CSV table of C-alpha atoms in Angstrom, one decimal:
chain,number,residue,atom,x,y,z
A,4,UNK,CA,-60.9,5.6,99.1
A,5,UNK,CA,-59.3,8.1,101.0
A,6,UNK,CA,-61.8,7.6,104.1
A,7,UNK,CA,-61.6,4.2,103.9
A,8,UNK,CA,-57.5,3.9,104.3
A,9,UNK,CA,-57.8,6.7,106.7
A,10,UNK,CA,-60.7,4.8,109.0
A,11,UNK,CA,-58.8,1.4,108.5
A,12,UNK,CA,-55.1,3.3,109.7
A,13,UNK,CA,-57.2,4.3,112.7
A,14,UNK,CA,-58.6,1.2,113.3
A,15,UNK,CA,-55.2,-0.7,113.4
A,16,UNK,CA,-53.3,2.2,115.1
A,17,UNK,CA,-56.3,1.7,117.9
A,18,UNK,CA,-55.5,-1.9,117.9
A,19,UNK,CA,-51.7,-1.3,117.8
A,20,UNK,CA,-51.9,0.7,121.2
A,21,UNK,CA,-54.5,-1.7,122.7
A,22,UNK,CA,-51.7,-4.3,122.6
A,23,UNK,CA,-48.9,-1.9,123.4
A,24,UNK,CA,-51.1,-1.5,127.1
A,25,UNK,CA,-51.5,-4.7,127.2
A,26,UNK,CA,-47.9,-6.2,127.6
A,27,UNK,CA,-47.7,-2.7,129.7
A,28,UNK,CA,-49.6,-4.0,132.2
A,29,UNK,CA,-48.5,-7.0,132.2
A,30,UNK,CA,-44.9,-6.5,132.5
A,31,UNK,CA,-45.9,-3.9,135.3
A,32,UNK,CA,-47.9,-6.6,137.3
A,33,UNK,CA,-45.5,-9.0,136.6
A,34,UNK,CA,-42.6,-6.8,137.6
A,35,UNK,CA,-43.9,-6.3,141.0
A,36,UNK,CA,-44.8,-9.6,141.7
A,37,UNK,CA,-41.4,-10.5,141.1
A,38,UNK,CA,-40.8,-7.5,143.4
A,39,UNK,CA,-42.6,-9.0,146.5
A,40,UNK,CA,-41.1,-11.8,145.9
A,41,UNK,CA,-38.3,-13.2,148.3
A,42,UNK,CA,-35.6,-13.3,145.6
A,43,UNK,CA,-32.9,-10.4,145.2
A,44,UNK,CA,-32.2,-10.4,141.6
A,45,UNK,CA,-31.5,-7.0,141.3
A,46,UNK,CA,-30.0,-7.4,137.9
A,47,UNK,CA,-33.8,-8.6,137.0
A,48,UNK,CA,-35.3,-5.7,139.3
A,49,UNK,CA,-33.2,-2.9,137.0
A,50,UNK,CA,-33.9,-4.7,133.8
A,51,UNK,CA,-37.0,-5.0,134.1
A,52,UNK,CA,-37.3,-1.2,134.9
A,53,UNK,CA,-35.5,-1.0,131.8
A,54,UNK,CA,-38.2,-2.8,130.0
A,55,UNK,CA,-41.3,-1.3,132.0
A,56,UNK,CA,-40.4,2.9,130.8
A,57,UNK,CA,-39.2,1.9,127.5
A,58,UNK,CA,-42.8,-0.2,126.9
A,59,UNK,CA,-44.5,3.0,128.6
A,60,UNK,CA,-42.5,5.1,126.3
A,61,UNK,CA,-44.0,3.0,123.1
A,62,UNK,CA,-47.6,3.2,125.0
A,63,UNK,CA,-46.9,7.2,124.6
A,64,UNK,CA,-45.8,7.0,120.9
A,65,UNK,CA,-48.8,4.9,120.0
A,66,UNK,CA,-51.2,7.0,121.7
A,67,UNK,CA,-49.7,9.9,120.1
A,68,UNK,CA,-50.2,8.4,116.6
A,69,UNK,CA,-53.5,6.9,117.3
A,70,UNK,CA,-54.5,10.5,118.5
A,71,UNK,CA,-53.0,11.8,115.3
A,72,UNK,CA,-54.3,9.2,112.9
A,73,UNK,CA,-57.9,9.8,114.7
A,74,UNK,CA,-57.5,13.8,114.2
A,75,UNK,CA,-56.5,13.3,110.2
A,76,UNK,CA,-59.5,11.2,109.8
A,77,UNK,CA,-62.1,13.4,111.5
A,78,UNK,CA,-60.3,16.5,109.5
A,79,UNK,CA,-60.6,14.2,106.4
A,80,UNK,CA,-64.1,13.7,107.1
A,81,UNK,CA,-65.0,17.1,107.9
A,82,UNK,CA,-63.5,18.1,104.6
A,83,UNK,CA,-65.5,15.5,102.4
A,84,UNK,CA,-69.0,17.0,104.3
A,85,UNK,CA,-68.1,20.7,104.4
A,86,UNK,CA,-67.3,20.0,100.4
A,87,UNK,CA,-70.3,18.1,98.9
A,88,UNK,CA,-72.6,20.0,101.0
A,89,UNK,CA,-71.2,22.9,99.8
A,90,UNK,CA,-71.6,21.8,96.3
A,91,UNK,CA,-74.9,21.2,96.9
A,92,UNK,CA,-75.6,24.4,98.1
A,93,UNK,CA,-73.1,26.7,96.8
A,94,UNK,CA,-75.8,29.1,95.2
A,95,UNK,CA,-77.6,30.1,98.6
A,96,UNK,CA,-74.1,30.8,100.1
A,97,UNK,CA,-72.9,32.8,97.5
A,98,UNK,CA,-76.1,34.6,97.2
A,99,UNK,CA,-76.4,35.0,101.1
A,100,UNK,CA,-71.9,36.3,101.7
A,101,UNK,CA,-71.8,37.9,98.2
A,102,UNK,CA,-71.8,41.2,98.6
A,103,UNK,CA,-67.8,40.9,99.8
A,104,UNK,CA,-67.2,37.9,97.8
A,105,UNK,CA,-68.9,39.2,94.6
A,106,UNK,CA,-66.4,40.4,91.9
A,107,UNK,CA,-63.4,38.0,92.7
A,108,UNK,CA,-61.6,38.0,89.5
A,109,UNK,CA,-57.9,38.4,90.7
A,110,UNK,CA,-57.5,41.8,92.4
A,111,UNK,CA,-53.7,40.6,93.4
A,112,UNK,CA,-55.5,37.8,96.1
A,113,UNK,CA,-54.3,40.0,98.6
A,114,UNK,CA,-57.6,42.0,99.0
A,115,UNK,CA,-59.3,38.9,98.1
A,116,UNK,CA,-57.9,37.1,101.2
A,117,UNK,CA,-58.9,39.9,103.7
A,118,UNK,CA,-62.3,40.3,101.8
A,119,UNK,CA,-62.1,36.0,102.8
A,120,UNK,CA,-61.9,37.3,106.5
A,121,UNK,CA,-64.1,39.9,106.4
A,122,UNK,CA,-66.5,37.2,105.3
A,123,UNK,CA,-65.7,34.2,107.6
A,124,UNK,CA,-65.7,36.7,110.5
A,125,UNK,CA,-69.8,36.7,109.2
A,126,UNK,CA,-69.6,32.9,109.2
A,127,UNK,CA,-68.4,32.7,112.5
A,128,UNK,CA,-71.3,34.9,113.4
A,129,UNK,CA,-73.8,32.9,111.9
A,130,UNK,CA,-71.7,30.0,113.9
A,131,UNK,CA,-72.7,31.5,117.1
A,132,UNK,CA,-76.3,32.9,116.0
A,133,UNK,CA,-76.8,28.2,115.2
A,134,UNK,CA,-75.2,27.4,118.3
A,135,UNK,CA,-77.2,30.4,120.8
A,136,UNK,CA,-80.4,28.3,119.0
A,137,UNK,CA,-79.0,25.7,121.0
A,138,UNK,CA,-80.5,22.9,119.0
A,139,UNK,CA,-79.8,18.8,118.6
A,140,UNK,CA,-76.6,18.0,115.9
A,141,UNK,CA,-76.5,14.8,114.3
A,142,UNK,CA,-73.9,13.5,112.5
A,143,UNK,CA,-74.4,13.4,108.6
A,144,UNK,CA,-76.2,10.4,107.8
A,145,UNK,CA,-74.1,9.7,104.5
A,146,UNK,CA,-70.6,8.6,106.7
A,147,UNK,CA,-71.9,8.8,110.1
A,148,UNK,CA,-70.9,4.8,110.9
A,149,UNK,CA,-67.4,4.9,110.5
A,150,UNK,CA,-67.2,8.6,112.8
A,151,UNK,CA,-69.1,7.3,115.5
A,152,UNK,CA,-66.7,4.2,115.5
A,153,UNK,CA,-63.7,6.8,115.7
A,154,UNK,CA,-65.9,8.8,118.2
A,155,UNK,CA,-66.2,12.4,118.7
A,156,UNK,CA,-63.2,12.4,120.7
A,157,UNK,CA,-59.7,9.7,121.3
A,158,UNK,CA,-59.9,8.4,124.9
A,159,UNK,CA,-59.1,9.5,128.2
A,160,UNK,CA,-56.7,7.0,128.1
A,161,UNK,CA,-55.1,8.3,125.2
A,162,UNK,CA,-54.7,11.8,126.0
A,163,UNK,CA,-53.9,10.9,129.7
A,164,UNK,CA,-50.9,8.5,128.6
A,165,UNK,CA,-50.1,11.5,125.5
A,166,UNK,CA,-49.7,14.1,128.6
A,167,UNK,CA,-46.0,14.3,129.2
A,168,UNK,CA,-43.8,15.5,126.2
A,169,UNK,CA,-40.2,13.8,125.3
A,170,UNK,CA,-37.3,15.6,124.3
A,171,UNK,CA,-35.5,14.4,120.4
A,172,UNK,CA,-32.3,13.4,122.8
A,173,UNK,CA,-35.1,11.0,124.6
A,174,UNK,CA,-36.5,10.4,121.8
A,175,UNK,CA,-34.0,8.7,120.1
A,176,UNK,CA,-32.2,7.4,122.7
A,177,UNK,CA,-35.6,5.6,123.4
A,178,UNK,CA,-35.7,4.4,119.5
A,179,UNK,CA,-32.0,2.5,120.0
A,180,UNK,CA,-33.5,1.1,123.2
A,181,UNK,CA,-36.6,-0.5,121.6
A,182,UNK,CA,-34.4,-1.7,118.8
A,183,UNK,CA,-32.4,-3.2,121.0
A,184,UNK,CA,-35.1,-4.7,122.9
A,185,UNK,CA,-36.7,-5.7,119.3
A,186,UNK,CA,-33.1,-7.4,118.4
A,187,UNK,CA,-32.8,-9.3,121.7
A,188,UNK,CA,-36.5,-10.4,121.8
A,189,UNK,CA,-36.2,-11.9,118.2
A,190,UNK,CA,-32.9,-14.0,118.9
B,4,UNK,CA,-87.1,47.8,109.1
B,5,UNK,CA,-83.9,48.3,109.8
B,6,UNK,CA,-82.1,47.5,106.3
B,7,UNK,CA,-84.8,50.6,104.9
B,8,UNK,CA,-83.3,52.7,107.7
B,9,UNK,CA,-79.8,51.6,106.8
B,10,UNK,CA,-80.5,52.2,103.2
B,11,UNK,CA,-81.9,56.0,103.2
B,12,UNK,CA,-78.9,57.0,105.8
B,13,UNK,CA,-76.7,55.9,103.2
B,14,UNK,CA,-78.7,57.6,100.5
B,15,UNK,CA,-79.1,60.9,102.5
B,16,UNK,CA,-75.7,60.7,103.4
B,17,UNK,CA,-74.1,60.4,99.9
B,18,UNK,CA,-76.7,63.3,99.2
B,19,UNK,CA,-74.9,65.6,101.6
B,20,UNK,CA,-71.4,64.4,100.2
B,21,UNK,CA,-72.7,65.6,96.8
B,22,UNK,CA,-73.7,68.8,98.0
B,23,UNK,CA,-70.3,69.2,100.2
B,24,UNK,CA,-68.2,68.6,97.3
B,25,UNK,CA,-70.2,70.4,95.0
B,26,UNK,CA,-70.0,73.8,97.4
B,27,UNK,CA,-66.4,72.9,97.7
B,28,UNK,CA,-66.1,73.3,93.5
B,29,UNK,CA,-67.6,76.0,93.6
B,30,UNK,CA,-65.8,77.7,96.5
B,31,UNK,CA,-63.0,76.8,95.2
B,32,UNK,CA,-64.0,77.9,91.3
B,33,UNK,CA,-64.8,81.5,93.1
B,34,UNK,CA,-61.7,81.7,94.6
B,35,UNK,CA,-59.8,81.2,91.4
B,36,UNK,CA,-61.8,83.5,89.2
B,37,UNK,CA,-61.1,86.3,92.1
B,38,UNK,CA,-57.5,85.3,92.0
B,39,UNK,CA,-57.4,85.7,88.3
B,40,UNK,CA,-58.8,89.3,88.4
B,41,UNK,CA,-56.7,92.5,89.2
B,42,UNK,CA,-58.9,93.2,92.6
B,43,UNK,CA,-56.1,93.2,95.7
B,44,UNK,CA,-58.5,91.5,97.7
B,45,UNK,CA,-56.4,90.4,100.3
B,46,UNK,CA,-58.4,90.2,103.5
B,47,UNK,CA,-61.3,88.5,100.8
B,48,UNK,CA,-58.2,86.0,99.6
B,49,UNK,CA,-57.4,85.0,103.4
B,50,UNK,CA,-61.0,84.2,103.8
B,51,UNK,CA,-61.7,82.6,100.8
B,52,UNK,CA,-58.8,80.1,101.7
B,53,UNK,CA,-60.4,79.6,104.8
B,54,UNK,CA,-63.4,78.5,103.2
B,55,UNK,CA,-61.4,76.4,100.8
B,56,UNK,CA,-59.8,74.7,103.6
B,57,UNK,CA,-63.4,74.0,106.2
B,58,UNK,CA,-65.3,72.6,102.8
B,59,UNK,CA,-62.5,70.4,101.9
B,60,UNK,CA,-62.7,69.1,105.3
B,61,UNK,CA,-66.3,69.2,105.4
B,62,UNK,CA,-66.4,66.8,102.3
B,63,UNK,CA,-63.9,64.4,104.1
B,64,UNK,CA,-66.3,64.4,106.9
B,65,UNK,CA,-69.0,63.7,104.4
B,66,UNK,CA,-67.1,60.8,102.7
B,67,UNK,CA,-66.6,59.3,105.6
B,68,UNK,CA,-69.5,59.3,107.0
B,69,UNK,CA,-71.1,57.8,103.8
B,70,UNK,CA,-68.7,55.1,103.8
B,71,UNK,CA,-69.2,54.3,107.3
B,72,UNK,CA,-73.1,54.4,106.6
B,73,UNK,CA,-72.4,52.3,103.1
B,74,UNK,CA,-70.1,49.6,105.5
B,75,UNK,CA,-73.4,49.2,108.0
B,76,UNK,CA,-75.9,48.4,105.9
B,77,UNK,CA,-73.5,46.6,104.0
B,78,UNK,CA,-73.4,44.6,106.8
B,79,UNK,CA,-77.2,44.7,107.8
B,80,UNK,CA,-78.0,43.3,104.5
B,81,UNK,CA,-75.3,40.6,105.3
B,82,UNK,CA,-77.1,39.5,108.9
B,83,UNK,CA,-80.3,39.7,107.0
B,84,UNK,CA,-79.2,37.2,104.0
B,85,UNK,CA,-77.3,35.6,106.6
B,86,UNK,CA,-79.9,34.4,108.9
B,87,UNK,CA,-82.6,33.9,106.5
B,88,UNK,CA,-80.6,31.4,104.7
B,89,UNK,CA,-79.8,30.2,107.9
B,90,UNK,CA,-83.1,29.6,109.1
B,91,UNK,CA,-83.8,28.0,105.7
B,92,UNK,CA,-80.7,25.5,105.9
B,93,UNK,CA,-79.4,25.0,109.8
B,94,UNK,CA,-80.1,21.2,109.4
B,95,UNK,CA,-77.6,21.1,106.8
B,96,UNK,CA,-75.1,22.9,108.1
B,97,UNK,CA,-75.2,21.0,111.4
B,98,UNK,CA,-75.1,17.7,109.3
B,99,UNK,CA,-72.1,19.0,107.4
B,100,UNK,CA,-70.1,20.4,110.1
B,101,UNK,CA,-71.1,17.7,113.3
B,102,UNK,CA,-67.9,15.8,113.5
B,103,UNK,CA,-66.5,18.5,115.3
B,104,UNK,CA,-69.2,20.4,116.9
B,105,UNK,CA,-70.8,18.3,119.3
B,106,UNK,CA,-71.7,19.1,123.3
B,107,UNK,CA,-70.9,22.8,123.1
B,108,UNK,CA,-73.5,23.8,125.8
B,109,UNK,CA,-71.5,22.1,128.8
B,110,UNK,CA,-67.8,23.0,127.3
B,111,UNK,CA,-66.0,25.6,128.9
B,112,UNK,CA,-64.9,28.7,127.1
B,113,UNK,CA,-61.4,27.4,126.1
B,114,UNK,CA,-63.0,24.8,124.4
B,115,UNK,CA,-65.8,27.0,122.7
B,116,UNK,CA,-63.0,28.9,121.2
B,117,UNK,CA,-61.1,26.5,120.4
B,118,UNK,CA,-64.1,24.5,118.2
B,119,UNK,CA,-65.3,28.2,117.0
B,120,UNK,CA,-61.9,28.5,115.4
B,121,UNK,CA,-62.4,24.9,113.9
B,122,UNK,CA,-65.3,25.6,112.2
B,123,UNK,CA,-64.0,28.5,111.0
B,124,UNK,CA,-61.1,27.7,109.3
B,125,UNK,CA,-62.9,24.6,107.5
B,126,UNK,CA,-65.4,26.9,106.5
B,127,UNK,CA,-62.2,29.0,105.1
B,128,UNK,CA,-61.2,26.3,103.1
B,129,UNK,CA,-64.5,25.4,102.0
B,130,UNK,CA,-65.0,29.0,100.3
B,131,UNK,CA,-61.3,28.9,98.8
B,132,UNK,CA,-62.6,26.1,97.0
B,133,UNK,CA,-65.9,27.7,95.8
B,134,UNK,CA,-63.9,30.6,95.1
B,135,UNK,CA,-61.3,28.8,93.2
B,136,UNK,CA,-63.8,27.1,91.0
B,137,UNK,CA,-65.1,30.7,90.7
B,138,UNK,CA,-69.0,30.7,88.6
B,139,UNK,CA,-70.9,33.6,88.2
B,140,UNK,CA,-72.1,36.1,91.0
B,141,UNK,CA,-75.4,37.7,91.6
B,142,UNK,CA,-77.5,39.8,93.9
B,143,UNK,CA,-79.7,37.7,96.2
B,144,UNK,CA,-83.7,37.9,95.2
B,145,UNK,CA,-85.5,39.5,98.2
B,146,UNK,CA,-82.7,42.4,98.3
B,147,UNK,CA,-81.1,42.5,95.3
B,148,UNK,CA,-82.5,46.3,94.3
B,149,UNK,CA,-80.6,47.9,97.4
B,150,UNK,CA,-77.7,46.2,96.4
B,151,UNK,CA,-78.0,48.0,92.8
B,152,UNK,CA,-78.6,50.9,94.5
B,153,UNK,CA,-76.0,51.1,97.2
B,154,UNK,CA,-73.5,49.2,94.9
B,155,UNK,CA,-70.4,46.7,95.4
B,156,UNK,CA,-67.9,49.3,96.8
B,157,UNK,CA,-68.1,53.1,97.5
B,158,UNK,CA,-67.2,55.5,94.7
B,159,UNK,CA,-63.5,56.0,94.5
B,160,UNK,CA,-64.2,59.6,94.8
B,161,UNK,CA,-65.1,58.5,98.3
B,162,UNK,CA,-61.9,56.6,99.1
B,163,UNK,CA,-59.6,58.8,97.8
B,164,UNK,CA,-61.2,62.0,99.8
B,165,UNK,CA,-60.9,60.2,103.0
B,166,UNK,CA,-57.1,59.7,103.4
B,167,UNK,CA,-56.1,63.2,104.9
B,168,UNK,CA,-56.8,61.5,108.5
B,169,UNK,CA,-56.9,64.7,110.3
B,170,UNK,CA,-56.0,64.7,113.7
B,171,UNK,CA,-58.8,65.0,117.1
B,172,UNK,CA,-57.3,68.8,117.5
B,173,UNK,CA,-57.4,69.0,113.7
B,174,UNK,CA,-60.7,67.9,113.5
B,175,UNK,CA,-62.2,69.9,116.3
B,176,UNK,CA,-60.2,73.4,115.3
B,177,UNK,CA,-62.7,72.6,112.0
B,178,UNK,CA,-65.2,71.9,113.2
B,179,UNK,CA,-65.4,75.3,115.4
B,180,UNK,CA,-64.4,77.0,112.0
B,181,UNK,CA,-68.1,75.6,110.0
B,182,UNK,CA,-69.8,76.5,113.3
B,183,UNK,CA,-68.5,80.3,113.0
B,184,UNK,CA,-68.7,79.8,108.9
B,185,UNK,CA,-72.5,78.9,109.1
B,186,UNK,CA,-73.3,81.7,112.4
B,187,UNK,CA,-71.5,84.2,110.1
B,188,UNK,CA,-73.1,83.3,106.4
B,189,UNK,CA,-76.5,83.5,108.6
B,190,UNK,CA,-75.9,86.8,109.0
């Protein structure tokens, strides 16, 4: 159930950040109609700057989770396919690597792990001997609906809005902020 | 072809390391036995040595070079295993590992790296786990009689021979010395 909880976080998070755009843009639009407007207000012109970066600030923090949640799930996936495949073809592997991987036992795990590289340095090759083939890729048939409703990749928008980085003094300076603005809201 | 080629270098090359260190022995026997006798022998000790010294690093040479030869078609057999099963089971491994290899063709190098290095590391995880579960190893089918033959790893004779690591000046002082060895036992 692990893919499941893991597509449904996804789903929500996408949702979640949806909605966090949405009262985004309409604060912005909003905020600059109040801006042609005739009326001064220039408490309301700083306060709603106020509110405008500290909702553009929670548009970056969902993005950044939805991009995170969306990367854990693809991993997950990826995982879950590399494994069962694996287990349903771990003879011709080991028969086609063994002659590094052969004789495991224990030898201290320290020759083992470089023995590992020595033979994922073959995978790679045989990576790049698939991929110079240059043929079609499918995804696996077995969970292939729930990772082409994730996609391959998270948005442009996403990454585009996950661009600029905050510092942990920002950061939560910006969490006391939206709990205010959470506090005052509710009242 | 090749993995036949591969496979009598190796065998042709761990026939000359058993006639290097078998000369050596008995160089080295001859020298003794002189040394044991009353005969001065002085200008026959110096020379002796100096045989001692070019077959000892006549036989590092030799190891070496068998391990070097022992490493390539260790490797040959490897591709050829490699690609075979390959050929047999591409569909699989594309349906396995999609969800993060799609579109390579029209990404840029960054990105082809950055994918290659993706797949590889799953793959890394996906072998700890076979390897952790651990079964029983054999040879593969089609080549498992060079594998008998050549064995898992080099002789330790041959590893423990090939640790002097002789400098280039070293190397090439000695290799001058068999040159005037061999134009001097022709005569």
């Amino acid at each position: 159930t692990a893919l499941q909880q893991a597509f449904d976080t996804c789903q929500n998070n996408k949702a979640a950040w949806l909605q966090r755009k949405n009262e985004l843009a309409a604060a912005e639009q909003e905020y600059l109609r109040l801006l042609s407007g005739e009326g001064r207000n220039v408490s309301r012109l700083d306060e709603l700057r106020n509110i405008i970066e500290v909702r553009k600030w929670q548009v970056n923090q969902a993005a950044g989770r939805y991009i995170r949640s969306h990367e854990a799930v693809q991993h997950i996936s990826i995982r879950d396919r590399l494994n069962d495949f694996m287990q349903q073809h771990g003879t011709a592997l080991a028969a086609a690597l063994a002659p590094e991987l052969m004789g495991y036992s224990e030898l201290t795990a320290i020759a083992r792990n470089c023995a590992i590289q020595r033979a994922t340095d073959a995978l790679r090759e045989a990576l790049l001997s698939w991929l110079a083939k240059g043929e079609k890729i499918n995804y696996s048939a077995q969970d292939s609906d729930i990772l082409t409703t994730i996609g391959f990749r998270p948005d442009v928008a996403s990454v585009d809005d996950s661009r600029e980085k905050f510092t942990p003094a920002q950061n939560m300076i910006f969490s006391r902020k939206s709990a205010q603005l959470a506090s005052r809201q509710s009242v």
